[PDB]
Amino acid sequence: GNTPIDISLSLTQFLLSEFVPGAGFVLGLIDLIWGFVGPSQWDAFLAQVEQLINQRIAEAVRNTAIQELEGMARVYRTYATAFAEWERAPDDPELREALRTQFTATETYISGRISVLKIQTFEVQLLSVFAQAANLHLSLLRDVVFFGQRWGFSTTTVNNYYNDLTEGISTYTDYAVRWYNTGLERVWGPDSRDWVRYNQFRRELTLTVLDIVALFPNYDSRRYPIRTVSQLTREIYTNPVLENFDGSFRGSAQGIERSIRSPHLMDILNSITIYTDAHRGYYYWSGHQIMASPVGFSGPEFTFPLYGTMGNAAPQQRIVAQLGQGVYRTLSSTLYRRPFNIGINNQQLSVLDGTEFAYGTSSNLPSAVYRKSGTVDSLDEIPPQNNNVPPRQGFSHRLSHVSMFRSGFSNSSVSIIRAPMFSWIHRSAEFNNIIASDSINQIPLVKGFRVWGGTSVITGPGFTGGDILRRNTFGDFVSLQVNINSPITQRYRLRFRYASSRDARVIVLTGAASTGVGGQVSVNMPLQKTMEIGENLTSRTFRYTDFSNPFSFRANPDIIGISEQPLFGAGSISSGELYIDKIEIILA
């Protein structure tokens, strides 16, 4: 089993860590995807979303798509070797000229024939190979913008390729998120079964499409002259009780989706205290409590409201999640009791009767076990990024929350449903905000610890790899905690990635005060209007500041605050919205 979900996760790992242009990058794209000779690989890629919504692609359209993929891999392969021979004698004017034509030949082939992956009425099924190919096209355009003057191309030829890269990022992004959403809505229905297949689409295409799409902007090598590491803070969802049910509870799907928490700052799951109930010698997970900390463990634990019902047929069991790299895997045992319809006191049960919590770790640390283990295995839906090493080392996601979809009390109620919902954040969403020397640091604003009043966390547009922050008025956004590995004397610069339907002014303060409240203004920067009032959030509505003017922190676990300030003379009324996604920090 080498699923497309497997391949795509290892590719997410590659792009996230070793994003820097050179032979290592080309050799890497060959090894993970484009080295494959023949059709079967692309056949599997299409099959996954095809059987997901149970519509196969028309065969003429399907085979042309597969054969153009083959040709794309095939022209890239010859570019890649021509690239390597050049990097072995980089000044030779003949190797240069040989790479220059083999580049323009391969770019024209890929550029021109992506079309066959955007075919009308088959947009969703073709989405995952389109994401692969758009990502391949962008690798090439980054290459010329970065190596143009070494290769021998004119500065005018390169500036045109650069505009292609710009537009490519914006066009490809917008197509993918558009067909992601319309494919999602088409799967939605009102039943337990309809929600399962809805969520299956969301999860698989978040892994196979959106995560590669979130990294496209890093292909802009004029905007990112050096290394940069993005962070995927979005959470994908599993539910063993519902995903393993053979029937379907009717009209539930709207109730299930609401039981997921609303957009929120990123937290670190600390512990889960499970409560047990019983009925007729059948013991089950009836409710639980969740405790979390902010990013950086920057202060006091938050305890979530009770999930489910606080049973006592056994004593509570407190499972600590946050050991090593967190819980990477759950193996649950489901229990569906179907009696000969007695009722109320001979109940119908749709619940969990055990779960094993497996730790992500380079160690022998044993799993946590509630009652007993099971065979409903989350690793089957959230696979490893590296199958060459044991799962506890090559895992892709860490457990981030546990909610519950509840129905009935044990009371009356002929029927009881306790369906715990497991949230998975991608591994790249680090526990701390660490400012690296030597790279371009991305800190999504969802990594702060406090949202100030009148800033909302809004579900992200689809290409930021997480949620974002909105203000309707001017005011304070977040406070977040930063760690430097430099003397406090070291100087830094800062830029924003924002969306705004108005002009505004943005400031970053750096006097600490845990809780946030303090601060001294260190950075003052303008935000030009990026969209019209009431427009939708597409990639063209997002903009980068310049870098900021050197500043320094004033503590080494520092507490910085972001606020948006009224422009002088504007009269203190603000109309439109302000969106901030990311701040990025560099050195010197």
Residue numbers in the entry: 53 to 640
Show sentences the authors wrote.
Two new chimeric Bacillus thuringiensis (Bt) proteins, Cry1A.2 and Cry1B.2, were constructed using specific domains, which provide insecticidal activity against key lepidopteran soybean pests while minimizing receptor overlaps between themselves, current, and soon to be commercialized plant incorporated protectants (PIP’s) in soybean. The two new chimeras adopt the well-conserved structure of 3 domain-Cry proteins. The high structural homology at the level of domain composition and folding supported the hypothesis that the two chimeras function in the same pore-formation mode-of-action as commercial Cry1 proteins such as Cry1Ab and the chimeric Cry1A.105 that maintain specificity to insects and have a long history of safe use (HOSU). Taken together, Cry1A.2 and Cry1B.2 represent two new proteins with toxicity against many key lepidopteran pests of soybean, with distinct binding preferences, that could be deployed with or without currently used insecticidal proteins in soybean.
Cry1A.2 is comprised of domain 1 from Cry1Ah (M22-D272), domain 2 from Cry1Ac (T259-E461), domain 3 from Cry1Ca (I467-D616) and the pro-toxin domain from Cry1Ac (E626-E1189). Compared to other Cry1A commercial Bt proteins, Cry1A.2 exhibited >50-fold greater insecticidal activity (LC50 at 14.51 ng/cm2) against SAW compared to Cry1A.107 and Cry1A.105, while maintaining significant efficacy on other soy pests including SBL, VBC and BLAW. Cry1A.2 exhibited no significant mortality and low to moderate stunting against CEW and OWB. The double mutant, Cry1A.2(E99C, R144C) (henceforth Cry1A.2-DIP) was identified using insect diet bioassays. The disabling substitutions highlighted in sphere for Cry1B.2-DIP are A160N and N176D and those for Cry1A.2 are E99C and R144C. The 2-way DIP competition assay results across all targeted soy lepidopteran species support distinct receptor preference of Cry1A.2 from all other insecticidal proteins evaluated. According to our DIP results on SBL, VBC and SPW, and the improved SAW/BLAW activity of Cry1A.2, comparisons with its Cry1A parent scaffold suggest that the Cry1C domain 3 of Cry1A.2 should be a major receptor binding contributor for these target insects either on its own, or via a receptor binding epitope nested between domains 2 and 3. Also, Cry1A.107 containing Cry1Ac domain 2 is highly active against OWB and CEW while the Cry1C protein and Cry1C domain 3-containing Cry1A.2 lacks significant activity on the two insects despite the presence of Cry1Ac domain 2. These observations are consistent with the hypothesis that the combined receptor binding domains (domains 2 and 3) in Cry1A.107 and Cry1A.2 target at least partially unique receptors across the insect species tested in this study, suggesting that Cry1A.2 would be insecticidal to these target insects even under a future Cry1A.107 resistance scenario.
